[PDB]
Amino acid sequence: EVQLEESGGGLVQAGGSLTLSCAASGFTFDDYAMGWYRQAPGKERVGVSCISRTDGYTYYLDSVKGRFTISTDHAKHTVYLQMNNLKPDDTGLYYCAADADPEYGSRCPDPYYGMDYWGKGILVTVS
Amino acid sequence: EKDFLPLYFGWFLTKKSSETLRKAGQVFLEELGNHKAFKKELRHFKLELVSYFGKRPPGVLHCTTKFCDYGKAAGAEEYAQQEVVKRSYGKAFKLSISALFVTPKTAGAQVVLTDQELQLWPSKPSASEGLPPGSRAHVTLGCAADVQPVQTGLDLLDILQQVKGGSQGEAVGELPRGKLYSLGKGRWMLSLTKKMEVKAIFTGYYG
């Protein structure tokens, strides 16, 4: 019954910036995790960044560390992914994810193991 | 970094998943104590199993992989130096539990590791012999009077040596979560109809 609504993607020139947002509806408690996964052309979905709402602990894929920052708005049940110094290699379908277990989901588990809830994906194209 | 090794490595269930499993285990201990199949065989074993196993895991539930003893245990250093152990430290896993079991000494859950998870199982006599790699993997839910949790692994291996050849016998009960088997010698196993999934972190405990 949880639903995840994504926005903020599109076309951007290399070296530019974007901020992705995802709003979660239907959670009955604050202590959960949210994050972002990316599917690049020809590749399997991979965790990019995840966060625990309560603790604030964050995970970053090494290839985005320093360039991407994940944050939350507690009241609004929204997560944000600030993507700076974008590279063509960052092109892909970006998927919001949430999980009811904040300790598990904040580690961006491999999709082999999975997340409880997924958005539909928004395209980011870096030219 | 030999002297900075943990007491043991393993998958430590999260706070939420440890509680979900703890509750499921308590439900089993009370279902079992009140099954007449169980009551019949107390000579081989009212007994309140929840109090009987009232030696609690003083922490989160977990599935130990390698007992290191701060590096003094045999093979501790060779386990911990593996690249897969270093790279998995702190990572999230969703593990599968296939059965719950009880003996006069321990109560536990059987963990069925996948091929990929077996890479974190450490590299025997005649209790693990003839069983698949990683068959000892378990979560202790309780221990009797003076029992230490290492005993739980030996108790599961003993049970699985029976299941190996169908000595499990015919089911003696059909619970909504699975079928119940009496293995004799006060040994009991609930085979879950659908595996339980538990969320856990691979990490190390330093005591």
Structure at a glance:
It is classed as protein binding. The complex is a heterodimer of chains A (127) and B (207). Chain A is built from one helix and eleven strands; from the N terminus they run βββββββββαββ.
Task: Set down the secondary structure blueprint.
The complex is a heterodimer of chains A (127) and B (207).
Chain A: E1 3-7, E2 10-12, E3 18-25, E4 33-39, E5 46-52, E6 58-60, E7 68-73, E8 78-83, E9 92-99, H1 102-105, E10 117-118, E11 122-126
Parallel strand pairs in A: 2-11
Antiparallel strand pairs in A: 1-3, 3-8, 4-5, 4-9, 5-6, 7-8, 9-10, 9-11
Chain B: E1 8-13, H1 15-33, H2 36-40, H3 49-52, E2 62-67, H4 76-81, H5 83-88, E3 92-102, E4 106-111, H6 115-118, E5 138-143, H7 150-163, E6 173-175, E7 178-184, E8 187-205
Antiparallel strand pairs in B: 1-2, 1-8, 3-4, 3-8, 4-5, 6-7, 7-8
3D structure, described in words:
The complex is a heterodimer of chains A (127) and B (207). Chain A has 127 residues and is mainly beta. Chain A has one domain (3-126): Sandwich (Immunoglobulin-like), CATH 2.60.40. Helices cover 3% and strands 47% of the residues of chain A. Chain A has one helix spanning 102-105; strands spanning 3-7, 10-12, 18-25, 33-39, 46-52, 58-60, 68-73, 78-83, 92-99, 117-118, 122-126. In chain A, strands 2, 4, 5, 6, 9, 10 and 11 form a 7-stranded mixed sheet that branches. In chain A, strands 1-3-8-7 form a 4-stranded antiparallel sheet, with no helix packed on it. With 207 residues, chain B is of the alpha+beta class. Chain B has helices spanning 15-33, 36-40, 49-52, 76-81, 83-88, 115-118, 150-163, and strands at residues 8-13, 62-67, 92-102, 106-111, 138-143, 173-175, 178-184, 187-205. In chain B, strands 1, 2, 3, 4, 5, 6, 7 and 8 form an 8-stranded antiparallel sheet that branches. Chain B is globular, with a radius of gyration of 17 Å. The chains are: A mainly beta (127), B alpha+beta (207). Chain A binds chain B through residues 100-105, 107-109, 112-114, and chain B through 14-17, 90-94, 116, 199-201.
